[PDB]
Scaffold this active site. Structure first.
Site, short mmCIF file in Angstrom:
data_model
loop_
_atom_site.label_atom_id
_atom_site.label_comp_id
_atom_site.label_asym_id
_atom_site.label_seq_id
_atom_site.Cartn_x
_atom_site.Cartn_y
_atom_site.Cartn_z
N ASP A 35 0.78 -1.23 0.00
CA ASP A 35 0.00 0.00 0.00
C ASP A 35 0.82 1.29 0.00
OD1 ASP A 35 -3.11 0.63 0.68
OD2 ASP A 35 -1.79 2.15 1.54
N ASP A 219 -1.73 5.53 -5.19
CA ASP A 219 -2.02 4.57 -4.14
C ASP A 219 -2.30 3.18 -4.69
OD1 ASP A 219 -2.86 3.18 -1.89
OD2 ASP A 219 -4.70 4.32 -1.60
C1 LIG Z 1 -4.81 3.79 2.25
C2 LIG Z 1 -5.74 2.63 1.72
N1 LIG Z 1 -5.21 2.25 0.40
C3 LIG Z 1 -5.94 1.43 2.69
C4 LIG Z 1 -6.96 0.37 2.30
C5 LIG Z 1 -8.30 0.53 2.81
C6 LIG Z 1 -9.33 -0.44 2.54
C7 LIG Z 1 -8.98 -1.58 1.74
C8 LIG Z 1 -7.65 -1.75 1.22
C9 LIG Z 1 -6.61 -0.77 1.47
C10 LIG Z 1 -7.39 -3.08 0.51
C11 LIG Z 1 -6.85 -3.13 -0.93
C12 LIG Z 1 -7.82 -2.67 -2.03
C13 LIG Z 1 -7.47 -3.00 -3.39
C14 LIG Z 1 -6.30 -2.30 -3.93
C15 LIG Z 1 -5.86 -2.59 -5.28
C16 LIG Z 1 -6.63 -3.56 -6.05
C17 LIG Z 1 -7.80 -4.24 -5.50
C18 LIG Z 1 -8.24 -3.98 -4.15
N2 LIG Z 1 -8.60 -1.44 -1.87
C19 LIG Z 1 -9.92 -1.22 -1.79
O1 LIG Z 1 -10.70 -2.17 -1.95
C20 LIG Z 1 -10.26 0.19 -1.50
C21 LIG Z 1 -9.32 1.09 -0.80
C22 LIG Z 1 -9.70 2.47 -0.65
C23 LIG Z 1 -10.93 2.97 -1.16
C24 LIG Z 1 -11.88 2.10 -1.78
C25 LIG Z 1 -13.14 2.72 -2.33
C26 LIG Z 1 -14.18 3.17 -1.37
C27 LIG Z 1 -15.38 3.86 -1.87
C28 LIG Z 1 -15.61 4.10 -3.29
C29 LIG Z 1 -14.60 3.65 -4.23
C30 LIG Z 1 -13.39 2.98 -3.75
C31 LIG Z 1 -12.41 2.73 -4.77
N3 LIG Z 1 -11.44 2.60 -5.39
C32 LIG Z 1 -11.53 0.71 -1.97
C33 LIG Z 1 -8.94 3.49 0.16
O2 LIG Z 1 -7.65 2.93 0.38
C34 LIG Z 1 -7.07 3.28 1.53
O3 LIG Z 1 -7.56 4.05 2.31
#
Ligand SMILES: C[C@@]1(N)Cc2cccc(c2)/C=C\C(c2ccccc2)=N\C(=O)c2cc(cc(-c3ccccc3C#N)c2)COC1=O
Length: 376
Positions: A35, A219
């Site tokens: 991340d 990110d």
């Molecule tokens: C710092 C941090 N990156 C931390 C974080 C928070 C929650 C989950 C993750 C990571 C898991 C991995 C994942 C991935 C990444 C790449 C590929 C596939 C899945 N990401 C998601 O699922 C994810 C992450 C974020 C916003 C939405 C999100 C929310 C609302 C509307 C649209 C979205 C999008 N994009 C979805 C915000 O991300 C963060 O805060």
């Protein structure tokens, strides 16, 4: 020479790219989310429905409890845990072992993802955004201070997953063409400056300040290409117009509705390419990265090897600035050159493309007053 680091990333379509990290003594290996949008290294340390395994501190003789709690709320989800330090290595990463800060996650809400196969997160961003505060040294900072590993890492995220995280250098087999660099504006998130946006070669014609209102960051832990409301709306209007051959329900463009196609029949050709121009390293010089619909149209967890490919429009709105997530990164080899405060982009050797179009990184272009595109 970085061959043993190639293909060290895994993951499930749409759930996160992770690398193996071994912590404690004796060894406890866990799958950790890569991340670049955060700066805390944390791992599940208690049983959870969505976790196959977790960190058992009592079994690690080298674990040192810092006697302090930590709470981390993200754009999506949050967790609480205990701070401490332990020995950490990355088997398929650099050949070193460091003592790093580690948060043991004991409770969480909407953070972990069922079936993702990862049990922790590796925050690769700077100390400025670490919790509880910037005194908690991030993992990569510890790595560089304790070892001779160069202050740089690169990411090749291959979508439908796998990929490579090269630590300490660049692996030429992971990209084609040249690497183009954009300055890291400020060392907190990996902030960059977008100076122009085009849909099928057509300038969106918005004041560039809107593209970075608040900020624009890279990110690897965000799935979509998130854009500020005003930019999102204009972008969607333009994308809809360019793909008029077929009409889609409004909800599709809002990510509220999915559209599925017969296997191998997705009409990629009807969707436009999108180009983001980034500030270059020389005055008045920029370059652009272009993604295809194969990047911004994401596959959704298949029902069971059915003859239907369902997709979700992965460009969405944001109230905290632009976020160049996996939608952007999957088309390229991205170099986080912390040492020279810059991020490089090159066409990835694994980006998904067809026989008519390919993702690209092109330059140079002349763009004036790029400095005025950033928010203060
Ligand atoms: C710092 C941090 N990156 C931390 C974080 C928070 C929650 C989950 C993750 C990571 C898991 C991995 C994942 C991935 C990444 C790449 C590929 C596939 C899945 N990401 C998601 O699922 C994810 C992450 C974020 C916003 C939405 C999100 C929310 C609302 C509307 C649209 C979205 C999008 N994009 C979805 C915000 O991300 C963060 O805060």
């Amino acid at each position: 020479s970085f061959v043993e680091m190639v293909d060290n990333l895994r993951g499930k379509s749409g759930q996160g790219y992770y690398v193996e990290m071994t912590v404690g003594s004796p060894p406890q290996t866990l799958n950790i989310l890569v991340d670049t949008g955060s700066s805390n290294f944390a791992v599940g340390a208690a049983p959870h429905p969505f976790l196959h395994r977790y960190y058992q501190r009592q079994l690690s003789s080298t674990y040192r409890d810092l006697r302090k709690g930590v709470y981390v709320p993200y754009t999506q989800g949050a967790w609480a845990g205990e701070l401490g330090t332990d020995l950490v290595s990355i088997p398929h990463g650099p050949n070193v072992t460091v003592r790093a800060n580690i948060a043991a996650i004991t409770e969480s809400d909407k953070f972990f993802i069922n079936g993702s196969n990862w049990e922790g997160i590796l925050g690769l961003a700077y100390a400025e955004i670490a919790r509880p505060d910037d005194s908690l040294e991030p993992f990569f900072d510890s790595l560089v201070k304790q070892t001779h590993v160069p202050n740089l890492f690169s990411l090749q995220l291959c979508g439908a997953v796998g990929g490579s995280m090269i630590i300490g250098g660049i692996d030429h087999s992971l990209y084609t063409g040249s690497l183009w660099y954009t300055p890291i504006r400020r060392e907190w998130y990996y902030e960059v400056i977008i100076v122009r946006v085009e849909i099928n070669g057509q300038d969106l014609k918005m004041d560039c300040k809107e593209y970075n209102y608040d900020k624009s960051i890279v990110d690897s832990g965000t799935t979509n290409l998130r854009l500020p409301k005003k930019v999102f709306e204009a972008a969607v209007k333009s994308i809809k117009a360019a793909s008029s051959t077929e009409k889609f329900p409004d909800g599709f463009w809002l990510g509220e509705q999915l559209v599925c196609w017969q296997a191998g029949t997705t009409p990629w050709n009807i969707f436009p390419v999108i180009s983001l121009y980034l500030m270059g390293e020389v005055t008045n010089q920029s370059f652009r990265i272009t993604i295809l619909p194969q990047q911004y149209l994401r596959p959704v967890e298949d029902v069971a090897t059915s003859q239907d490919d369902c997709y979700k429009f992965a460009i969405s709105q944001s109230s905290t600035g632009t976020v160049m997530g996996a939608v952007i990164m999957e088309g390229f080899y991205v170099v986080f050159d912390r040492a020279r405060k810059r991020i490089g982009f090159a066409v990835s050797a694994c980006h998904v493309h067809d026989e008519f179009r390919t993702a690209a990184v092109e330059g140079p272009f002349v763009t004036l007053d790029m400095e005025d595109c950033g928010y203060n």
